[PDB]
Design an enzyme around this catalytic site. Structure first.
Site, PDB file in Angstrom:
ATOM      1  N   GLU A 164     -29.154  25.080  51.129  1.00  0.00           N
ATOM      2  CA  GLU A 164     -28.622  24.911  49.812  1.00  0.00           C
ATOM      3  C   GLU A 164     -28.396  26.259  49.172  1.00  0.00           C
ATOM      4  O   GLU A 164     -29.155  27.210  49.408  1.00  0.00           O
ATOM      5  CB  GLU A 164     -29.583  24.061  48.964  1.00  0.00           C
ATOM      6  CG  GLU A 164     -29.158  23.806  47.525  1.00  0.00           C
ATOM      7  CD  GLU A 164     -27.786  23.164  47.400  1.00  0.00           C
ATOM      8  OE1 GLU A 164     -26.817  23.760  47.837  1.00  0.00           O
ATOM      9  OE2 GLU A 164     -27.668  22.090  46.825  1.00  0.00           O
ATOM     10  N   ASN A 223     -25.896  26.334  45.959  1.00  0.00           N
ATOM     11  CA  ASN A 223     -25.562  25.981  44.598  1.00  0.00           C
ATOM     12  C   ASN A 223     -25.984  24.558  44.318  1.00  0.00           C
ATOM     13  O   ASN A 223     -25.531  23.630  44.973  1.00  0.00           O
ATOM     14  CB  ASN A 223     -24.076  26.192  44.368  1.00  0.00           C
ATOM     15  CG  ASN A 223     -23.676  26.080  42.910  1.00  0.00           C
ATOM     16  OD1 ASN A 223     -24.194  25.255  42.169  1.00  0.00           O
ATOM     17  ND2 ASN A 223     -22.669  26.858  42.520  1.00  0.00           N
ATOM     18  N   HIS A 247     -48.989  22.512  43.398  1.00  0.00           N
ATOM     19  CA  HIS A 247     -48.703  21.990  42.083  1.00  0.00           C
ATOM     20  C   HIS A 247     -47.340  21.316  42.007  1.00  0.00           C
ATOM     21  O   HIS A 247     -47.088  20.475  41.140  1.00  0.00           O
ATOM     22  CB  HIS A 247     -48.907  23.035  40.983  1.00  0.00           C
ATOM     23  CG  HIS A 247     -47.779  24.003  40.823  1.00  0.00           C
ATOM     24  ND1 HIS A 247     -47.825  25.300  41.321  1.00  0.00           N
ATOM     25  CD2 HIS A 247     -46.598  23.883  40.173  1.00  0.00           C
ATOM     26  CE1 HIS A 247     -46.699  25.915  40.997  1.00  0.00           C
ATOM     27  NE2 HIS A 247     -45.933  25.071  40.318  1.00  0.00           N
ATOM     28  N   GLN A 258     -22.910  22.341  43.173  1.00  0.00           N
ATOM     29  CA  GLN A 258     -21.650  22.309  43.920  1.00  0.00           C
ATOM     30  C   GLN A 258     -21.920  22.026  45.373  1.00  0.00           C
ATOM     31  O   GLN A 258     -22.965  22.379  45.934  1.00  0.00           O
ATOM     32  CB  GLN A 258     -20.923  23.653  43.822  1.00  0.00           C
ATOM     33  CG  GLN A 258     -20.389  23.972  42.461  1.00  0.00           C
ATOM     34  CD  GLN A 258     -19.706  25.318  42.399  1.00  0.00           C
ATOM     35  OE1 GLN A 258     -19.561  25.896  41.311  1.00  0.00           O
ATOM     36  NE2 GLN A 258     -19.298  25.848  43.560  1.00  0.00           N
ATOM     37  N   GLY A 282     -39.522  26.244  38.152  1.00  0.00           N
ATOM     38  CA  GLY A 282     -38.571  25.801  39.147  1.00  0.00           C
ATOM     39  C   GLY A 282     -38.501  26.718  40.344  1.00  0.00           C
ATOM     40  O   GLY A 282     -37.913  26.364  41.362  1.00  0.00           O
ATOM     41  N   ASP A 317     -53.039  26.993  45.893  1.00  0.00           N
ATOM     42  CA  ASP A 317     -51.804  26.380  45.450  1.00  0.00           C
ATOM     43  C   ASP A 317     -50.811  26.416  46.567  1.00  0.00           C
ATOM     44  O   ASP A 317     -49.882  27.243  46.624  1.00  0.00           O
ATOM     45  CB  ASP A 317     -51.285  26.995  44.169  1.00  0.00           C
ATOM     46  CG  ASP A 317     -50.195  26.206  43.560  1.00  0.00           C
ATOM     47  OD1 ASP A 317     -49.920  25.072  44.035  1.00  0.00           O
ATOM     48  OD2 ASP A 317     -49.609  26.733  42.609  1.00  0.00           O
ATOM     49  N   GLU A 331     -25.476  22.035  53.265  1.00  0.00           N
ATOM     50  CA  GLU A 331     -26.732  21.392  52.900  1.00  0.00           C
ATOM     51  C   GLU A 331     -27.129  20.354  53.956  1.00  0.00           C
ATOM     52  O   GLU A 331     -26.278  19.663  54.504  1.00  0.00           O
ATOM     53  CB  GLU A 331     -26.619  20.690  51.558  1.00  0.00           C
ATOM     54  CG  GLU A 331     -26.256  21.608  50.402  1.00  0.00           C
ATOM     55  CD  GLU A 331     -24.789  21.637  50.104  1.00  0.00           C
ATOM     56  OE1 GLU A 331     -23.957  21.557  51.052  1.00  0.00           O
ATOM     57  OE2 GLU A 331     -24.451  21.779  48.913  1.00  0.00           O
ATOM     58  N   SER A 360     -41.465  27.846  41.466  1.00  0.00           N
ATOM     59  CA  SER A 360     -42.716  27.404  42.058  1.00  0.00           C
ATOM     60  C   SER A 360     -42.501  26.879  43.428  1.00  0.00           C
ATOM     61  O   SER A 360     -41.531  26.147  43.680  1.00  0.00           O
ATOM     62  CB  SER A 360     -43.262  26.248  41.233  1.00  0.00           C
ATOM     63  OG  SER A 360     -43.771  26.704  39.994  1.00  0.00           O
ATOM     64  N   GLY A 361     -43.403  27.243  44.319  1.00  0.00           N
ATOM     65  CA  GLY A 361     -43.378  26.717  45.667  1.00  0.00           C
ATOM     66  C   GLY A 361     -42.512  27.546  46.583  1.00  0.00           C
ATOM     67  O   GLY A 361     -42.653  27.446  47.809  1.00  0.00           O
TER      68      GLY A 361
END
Ligand SMILES: [Ca+2]
Ligand SMILES: [Cl-]
Length: 240
Positions: free
Chosen positions: A59, A61, A45, A64, A186, A93, A69, A188-189
């Protein structure tokens, strides 16, 4: 994640942020799990929308510079072929994203360990959800990666009338439902990490919460059961 705590920077190195291009910037939309140096496991989704996606590994933050990253484009999106966006309750899903480059592994960037095929967690198994999702129902994304302790709720309980009923399938993992802690939009996944025989494995891909709210008692967060898709995952990776 509602009722979470800030994750230590190196606790969940397979967690990724799946982001979409918005104007001159990028917005976090979903979590994911790095499962190969060039493959991410996320929710189908998360990628129904025809957006430009990138993955950020290492990652912590979203707001910031962490100095850890790595940003990588999504080169190919393989959604489970039985996914139907209008029927998240049917399951499937899950999606794999082949990254345009292979990311470099380090203490912040590691492959998520997946359970063996068919593994089902005993009720009340210890797990953490992680993510940058909303910190409250109808709230805002977290800046720093959050974790919440969400023990599993087995199928028999989860699919009971006062929980999710028929909506939950055995291809899903339920976790939480305490009314305090939960995934939220957010997340999700992203992963549900569960401690089994001393090692955390990613047993879930965050899929849905109640339309009533994230942290709703007896509406545990629902995850795609990763162990239901091991063959699928391996098939995808092998054919791509
Ligand atoms: Ca950052
Ligand atoms: Cl991890």
């Amino acid at each position: 994640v509602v009722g979470g705590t800030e994750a230590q920077r190196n606790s969940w190195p397979s967690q990724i942020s799946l982001q979409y291009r918005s104007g001159s910037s990028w917005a976090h939309t979903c979590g994911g799990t790095l499962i190969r140096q060039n493959w991410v496991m996320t929710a189908a989704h998360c990628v129904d929308r025809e957006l430009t996606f990138r993955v950020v590994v290492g990652e912590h933050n979203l707001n910031q510079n962490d100095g850890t990253e790595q940003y990588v484009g999504v080169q190919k999106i393989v959604v489970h072929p039985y996914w139907n966006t209008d029927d998240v309750a049917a399951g499937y899903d899950i999606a794999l994203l082949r990254l345009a480059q292979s990311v470099t592994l380090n203490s912040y960037v590691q492959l998520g360990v997946l359970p063996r095929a068919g593994t089902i967690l005993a009720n009340n198994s210890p797990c953490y959800i992680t993510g940058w999702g909303l910190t409250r129902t109808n709230g805002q994304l977290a800046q720093t990666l959050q974790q919440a302790y969400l023990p599993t709720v087995d199928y028999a309980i989860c699919s009971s009338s006062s929980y999710w009923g028929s909506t939950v399938k055995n291809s899903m993992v339920c976790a939480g439902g305490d009314g305090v802690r939960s995934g939220c939009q957010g997340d999700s996944g992203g992963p549900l990490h569960c401690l089994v025989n001393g090692q955390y494995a990613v047993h879930g891909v965050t899929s849905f919460v109640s339309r009533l709210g994230c942290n709703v008692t007896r509406k545990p967060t629902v995850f795609t059961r990763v162990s239901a898709y091991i063959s699928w995952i391996n098939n995808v990776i092998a054919s791509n």
